[PDB]
Amino acid sequence: QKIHVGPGELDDYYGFWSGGHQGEVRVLGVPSMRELMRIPVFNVDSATGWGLTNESRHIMGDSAKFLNGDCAHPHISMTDGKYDGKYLFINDKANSRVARIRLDIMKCDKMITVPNVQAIHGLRLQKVPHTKYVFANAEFIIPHPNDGKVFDLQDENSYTMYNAIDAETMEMAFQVIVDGNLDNTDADYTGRFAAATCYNSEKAFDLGGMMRNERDWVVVFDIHAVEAAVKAGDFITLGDSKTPVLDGRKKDGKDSKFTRYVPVPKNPHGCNTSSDGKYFIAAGKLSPTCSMIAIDKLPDLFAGKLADPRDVIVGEPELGLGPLHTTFDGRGNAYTTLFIDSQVVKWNMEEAVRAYKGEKVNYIKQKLDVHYQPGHLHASLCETNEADGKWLVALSKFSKDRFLPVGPLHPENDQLIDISGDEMKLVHDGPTFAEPHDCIMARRDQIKTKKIWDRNDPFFAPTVEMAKKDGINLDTDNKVIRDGNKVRVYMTSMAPAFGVQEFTVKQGDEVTVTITNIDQIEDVSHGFVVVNHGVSMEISPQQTSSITFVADKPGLHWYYCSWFCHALHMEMVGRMMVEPAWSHPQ
């Protein structure tokens, strides 16, 4: 299998890496493991202006005030259990958000703050019939309402919630109150069932208290029952949020219609659906096991045809110390990270099932040493029924001496492993910044990108509407619109010239500069920087972008095109002249 991508050769897969604590999404080529693009999401990006432009801040809403995010879980939308290449979704634990990225323009186009929750961590997509819902875990128990009167996690109104976001509208669909808390989550291959691990069944805040129970659980959601209750209006609302809220807690030992609690040891973490649709597989973490939940036994479980919730477990292989996460080659094998043993263990799922029934069989096929302390891992197309068993990435936390020293901070070691055969083979150590934690791969033919924006693209449609109120045709106009103490500059740009090369304002004026790149050639990006005003953005071919700033300094102030666009790139400059406040009314 081709391991190295030479000058002139192209990668075979796209890889979408979480940006970890840094807050972006990164596009890599696989197997070269080189970063091809950065997609700003929860970070403020100086290069493109994401977080500074009006278009990006409009998408971020009120959360545009935050300069940080904490990503972990990137996933690609699906149709009939295969990637369809339309959207990527990612979580923000730091400020409780979910973001959607459009894979044709490789930009975040929608973002939502999940109401009435703290810390959006685990995130996974419905597989079948398509990604109608984005499922997202809120990790931490909070009071409801969280108004400062009650702080006790054991109060009857202190809880966290499972969250479902409409993937296409990026509005909330519903929320399910659960017992305990939520860690990771996955979905079945029918649309009926989703599942989440819980590590805090104790609802504690101290470390010992969170580890008290021998078993926490994976909570299983009957989404069909949830949708039925919403359509019937059997729900409540919290605060000023109109999101339907359903109660999935046990009340005095009796189950709700919406949930079932399957005892699983211990502080389990990973929650992974096998590519054949047979199992929710939970990684035991503090327990040296994984637990295998038979999805075809869930209808019976929710119908009361089983006596004990444990009866849906058909395997609990002992695997090694600190199992965290599992992935699949599509050949019947599972691959699980062992954080403490520092390995990836390859095991046969159907043989583990037989061992649970008492048959002595060695389901463990191979243990590969990794370097070191692996968290999550990802096999190519593992979240689809097209799981191809070619590439595996294990994302290890402590890189130690695997790379040159670079001061007190260390990179994550994202190691590429060849799993096309019976023997796992380590082929590449990829260092990455701010702990990506997890990633997702797609074949080259599953991603189709645009090189030239459409003029009606929704990403800047609000800006087009603003332009229209000023009577502006953005494709042609080079005009300075004045409006009180607001100035709206509209210009085309075509390398190597700004359509407006100078304009004059009053000190204190609020200046909006809107640029429409009317070059129609691939890869002629322009930039726009106003010197010493903290203003910077990118404008790709046929895009409109805009940015607003206060002309708070009198005098002449240069602006320039930041992105190398033309042999005369260095002459693509202009001047803003700011008349001093003392020559104007006060």
Next chain:
Amino acid sequence: ESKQKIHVGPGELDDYYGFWSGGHQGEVRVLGVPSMRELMRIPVFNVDSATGWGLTNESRHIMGDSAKFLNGDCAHPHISMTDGKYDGKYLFINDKANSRVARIRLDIMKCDKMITVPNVQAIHGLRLQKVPHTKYVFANAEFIIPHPNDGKVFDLQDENSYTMYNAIDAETMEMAFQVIVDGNLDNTDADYTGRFAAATCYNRDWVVVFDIHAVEAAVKAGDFITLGDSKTPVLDGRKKDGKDSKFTRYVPVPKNPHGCNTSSDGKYFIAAGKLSPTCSMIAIDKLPDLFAGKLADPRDVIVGEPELGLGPLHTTFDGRGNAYTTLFIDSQVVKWNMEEAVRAYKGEKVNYIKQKLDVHYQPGHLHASLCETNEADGKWLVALSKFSKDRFLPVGPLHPENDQLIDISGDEMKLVHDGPTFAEPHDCIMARRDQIKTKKIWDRNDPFFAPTVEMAKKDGINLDTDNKVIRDGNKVRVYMTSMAPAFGVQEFTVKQGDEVTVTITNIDQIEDVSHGFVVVNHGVSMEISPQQTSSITFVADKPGLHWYYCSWFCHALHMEMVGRMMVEPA
């Protein structure tokens, strides 16, 4: 033969550090060479969610008032030198967007100082004194502006409209002096003695040469002015009625010249012709006669002007006598022999061109290993090309820069790797592995957080041991140690509206056990490495219980390393 191993397999280490400009994104990146893998990101002019740079009090103190800016535009990274060789102390980098120079300490891989250059706009070209050491950082301000720039005069041809050449004291990161010039400044470099520096310039254009010794003598005697509210000594290096300054000479060079590169034997300032398909070679050994008025014509210091190809932009050196120049239009790197060019300029029939290698596509800068030092080793070359076209998978409307690694160890250049990079790094610098010595554990006395140690002292806090909440009006100062997997303060209570500062000291002593600190839904994030103190300030404007958690994976029980901030309603 060019035969070097290009593959760094698992368990093997790179041979060089590469320091990449972060381009329009504003950071510095540390790469391993020859793998071309990114080992680390160093935040500088960007705000980094991961480490908290731009949010923490320590970082905002370094940035000063410019902490209000969330952007930067980097191009020119360079490493400090002693006796013409890299000494591993500091990296310096420019910010064209908000007119800054930043210093990175290579032992901790953090920006530790930053200056806004006064009375200029757009710090672009930047390079370091070589000899006897990097006393000065030299920085070009690109754009001509009025002086003062108070909105009375906007005319760029006015007598008081100009730009200036800037010298920053490398060790103090305070301004040393500024020299007014004629024209706009592009790129700059320094000689191997400390007397001379030079910059490409325009409005045939020129390479202006600076007699730094003469500038220093005038500062010592007090023959300077100051501008506005900056105490920086300002010297006038302009021509006046055809009469030369004592500080400058203008050497005519065609045409809109761009790169300005000192050969590693110290013989030449080489200016890349750009619009002229040439480079111009200025003989540094003739500059003293030039300034002494002993030459008849400024063009007499030009000892070579080889024709190389269309659009020469930048030049580097293998230490074997060859120069390598990017041809932007022809889209190549051309290898040529400098002494043969000098003889050709005299009329000898000698072909100084050795090889042209196609690169992909439109190269700007290039960099050979140790090229800025008299130890230039002729092993690796990186050419940084702007239009990557079909060399990588398509990724939407934006495109990566193509930073191509070329083996120059033998007679023939060989292209070995295409490295895609984000936001047009533009230029880079390499150092031998043994030229860089980094700390894995912080020193408790490090100046990076010494202002925070000082704050702790006024509160009576021993940062190494204490877990205490200090109340001070509507200000709350939490101090805590952290040791995986537990925050030393796991809960604290404040009043809605309080201004909370959380100072965390990581007292783990094992390498690479970093902790984080994130306050959910408050925009608060930072990293604390072993034996570091880091602090962050935010207002508790929302009543109720608000979780904080450790963001950096520190322990098997990392997920459980959490705490609770309780906010009582107003």
